[PDB]
């Protein structure tokens, strides 16, 4: 009868809405970069959970290359994580060429992405043990006291490239930083709050 | 050395050329416009489906014109009885990820895949009365975009490692695979007759290969960029597809040619899914904007421009019987248009 | 896939008794549950119906306002409470998992049952026939009547051959006419034209002999044909 | 090494399709157009069915 | 008592400058308010919960100048009623004022949810908003509007017109009276009342949300410029807000404070009545403004 | 307008000139 299927159909649609409800605060992360970078520094899949809420990140590596066909699927991710190694110069090139196939590639222009560098200690070792030549460290970066600006101008120059070539509009930002830890949760988090707040105003008209 | 073996690869493909140009004659559009076109049609949605919870990706109609198949990045299956709009089963996937999915011919087996590089079998008609995992394939090393069933116990699967293979459900192995695809492949449509089956990869190149024999027939360079969707033509000697490049083109496999194509100034985005009516005087096409346009199939003309999706679509299909189509778009909405 | 009843036995009239049936095998959530009583040299008649989640129940007009029915999921158990008995309440019990669906089986599997001894303006259907005298070698026939047309206005008919082995639990053959359910051979068909219908068999065989009984599903108070025997 | 067996299979696949078996477009043509004039009254798109006759409604 | 040495308040040349201004602000009224209606329609991508009650503000603005400013500048032109010695008059009389008074309650009100909404938003970070108009902003809209109409209910009866006989002249006036014991009730504390739900709840209410929205927003160098800049034209809507409907329940307050008259003759009356049509076109200019301000702080909405 | 007794000629005469509210 018409009527046991129809009650079928309300269960499911009542089980439906059920894991939906535990699906729209995931929160969930993509994670992708150069194979030297430090992906487990930090389809894979991680649980961690901070301040009543979960992660979900992705981790994508069974993908030949080119990353441009399957990225599609990821239209709907609250950030993308974007990892290089900043200690490495050879290949930091056609990394950041990598950056840009991400910035500017369609159906991915709504989607922030956070610069997560790492090897800052092995980047200082390696320095105390052509547009560089040229250039000074912007006064409204303040460095921490009791660190030596030898690396701080270098670090400082690689900020300012990132900027200039995400730059090159206000509906996605990047926000390029650096890092070499148990605070990396938190600041995630703090970086979510963030582009979900900025995005609530897309909506509002404010 | 090698440099001998280059010398002939131009030599056939100057050969190739100039035999098309000489079997090529003037164009069918002098002879298509004789008799009177179609024209703009009204058709509007029946079925205004709710339910589902993410975007739809991919989808398939079974044998009768009634049941659906629908697949989403929640990792739910949902079974839709179009008459009266409720869902028949709910099967949980256990990965999210899934770009793909088909009906059996005999109704009895679903098939889907995506990013977890596994083709996951299920059966609707069990004993235990829930759909339970009939069978994982294994052995792909890049995602598996497009799959459809050959028989009830023989499937065909496109994956993204710029090569096709077969598989039997019995046994569980690879049976032959078809790897003279130099670039990354989504789109495969099989011959009515079950002989046949073409395939477009992201290289602009749609190829026609055998069941058995298992090498590439002819091949077909004319398309621009990235191949979306391709189909069969209902009598099974022509076969169409779209591309990322905003146009659609038909071509013939008897001719070995390009025959005609359809475009327009008006539209940029490209064509996400193909299909033909049942006759094959229609062709309905998706696109990345919020309309759906369909082409006459023989003269090019805007039959429809029916739109009512937020977002674009992602496929397409046509009942066997051609009583009814039925679109689906990332707005988590599917459309029934009589 | 089995199920299996409890309970039963002897009862003073008058008194009260719960019935309940375990079943294993299968996923009893999304299985509707129905209760069909067979009263001894007589035909089955349908007492009470429970839906997936316990949304919905239904009783026959005999029992109803006088028994209840329960279902518990997490240990896959049904329960039927007796209140009151008498003479005629006496008969074999049966317990029939179902579920409806386009392109389903209802009344697909039948319980073996428990024993139980004491101390209108519906739907009816009945058969001329009761018991013919036929070999085993050749093709059978029967043929059944109803009062009222089961041809729903979706599409199809709601009739539903059971087949009785002496001593042995029911089973189904044809839930519909023109479409063969699992688990039995091809030589067995049905077709009707809404008044009247129709059953063949290609062959007989010596498994085959039992009692033949008709079913509807067109309105919810169901009602069993008289049951037709064949003998060899 | 790897580029000669792949050149040497590729130029026998093309070996194996340049001869092939082709016709006149134009016959091709007139054939596809005698096909779909064929089921000119069949196909329910170019003539929607009656709701009498229509099992959707 | 009985009459003053003077009469009349009204002067020549106020009642023709204001006019044309007042037809000025008409025109640019329509046009304004019925562009933000006529692009939420038509752009079809548009219907969400946030928008609706852009809409409802939006659409009930315009009633209210399409309603209150023309029949405010006919009665300062000439100072009669539209109809006269008609029973339809009598109608349009108990008419005009009950659907001005609703027209304010929806739009004091959606301003109130507006703020609630926003608030909730930024409280709420795991929740993004998306397509489609929540049940619970479908419901709230229909209640917004159904407890205002309630409301003004107590408005639109007992507002009949009532003759006068005095200085050898005959005319048709109208205003509201009391009939009976909840009607005086309710006339001895309309002006309380009206100040405390246009004023009192709606200000406090919506200000402790916009600064308990910011705080928590407060709570790293091109993001906290943009925050600075939304904040300040939140508030600032607030501010105007406050200001544009302040003569309006300031002239009635002080009928109850500085008013049984001492010969204060027309230099009290007047001075109230120009505030009083001052004000009106005060809080218009605030309904005016009201749509443009949401196209200059953002760019989404295209004329 | 919210004068008592309807008798002053003042109230009434600032209400038919005054806006209504």
Known sequence: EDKAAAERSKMIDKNLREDGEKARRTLRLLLLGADNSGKSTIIFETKFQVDKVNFHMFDVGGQRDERRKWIQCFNDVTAIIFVVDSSDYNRLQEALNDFKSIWNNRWLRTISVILFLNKQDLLAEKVLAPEFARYTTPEDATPEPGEDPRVTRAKYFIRKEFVDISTADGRHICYPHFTCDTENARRIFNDCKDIILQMNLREYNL | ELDQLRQEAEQLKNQIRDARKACADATLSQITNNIDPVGRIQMRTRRTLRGHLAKIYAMHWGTDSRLLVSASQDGKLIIWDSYTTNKVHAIPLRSSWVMTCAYAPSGNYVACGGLDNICSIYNLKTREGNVRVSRELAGHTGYLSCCRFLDDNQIVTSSGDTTCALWDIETGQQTTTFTGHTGDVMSLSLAPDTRLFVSGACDASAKLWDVREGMCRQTFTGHESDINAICFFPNGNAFATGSDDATCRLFDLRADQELMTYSHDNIICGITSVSFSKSGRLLLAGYDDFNCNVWDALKADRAGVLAGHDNRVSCLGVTDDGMAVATGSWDSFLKIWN | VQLVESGGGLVQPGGSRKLSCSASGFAFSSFGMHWVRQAPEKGLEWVAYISSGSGTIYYADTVKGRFTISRDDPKNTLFLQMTSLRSEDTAMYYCVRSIYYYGSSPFDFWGQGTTLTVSSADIVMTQATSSVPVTPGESVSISCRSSKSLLHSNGNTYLYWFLQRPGQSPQLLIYRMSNLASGVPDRFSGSGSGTAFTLTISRLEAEDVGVYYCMQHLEYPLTFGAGTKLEL | ?57 | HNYCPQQTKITSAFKYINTVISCTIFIVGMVGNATLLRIIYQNKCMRNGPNALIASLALGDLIYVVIDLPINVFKLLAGRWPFDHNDFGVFLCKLFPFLQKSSVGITVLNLCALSVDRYRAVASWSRVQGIGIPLVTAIEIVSIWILSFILAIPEAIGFVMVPFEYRGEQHKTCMLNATSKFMEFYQDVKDWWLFGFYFCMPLVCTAIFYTLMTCEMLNLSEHLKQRREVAKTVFCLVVIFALCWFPLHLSRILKKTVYEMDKNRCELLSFLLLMDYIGINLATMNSCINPIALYFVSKKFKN | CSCSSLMDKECVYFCHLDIIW
């Open chain 4, 1 to 57: 090494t790897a580029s000669i067996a792949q050149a040497r299979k590729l130029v026998e696949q093309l070996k194996m399709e340049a001869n092939i078996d082709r016709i006149k477009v134009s016959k091709a043509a007139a054939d596809l157009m005698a096909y779909c004039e064929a089921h000119a009254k069949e196909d329910p798109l170019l003539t929607p069915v009656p709701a009498s006759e229509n099992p959707f409604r």
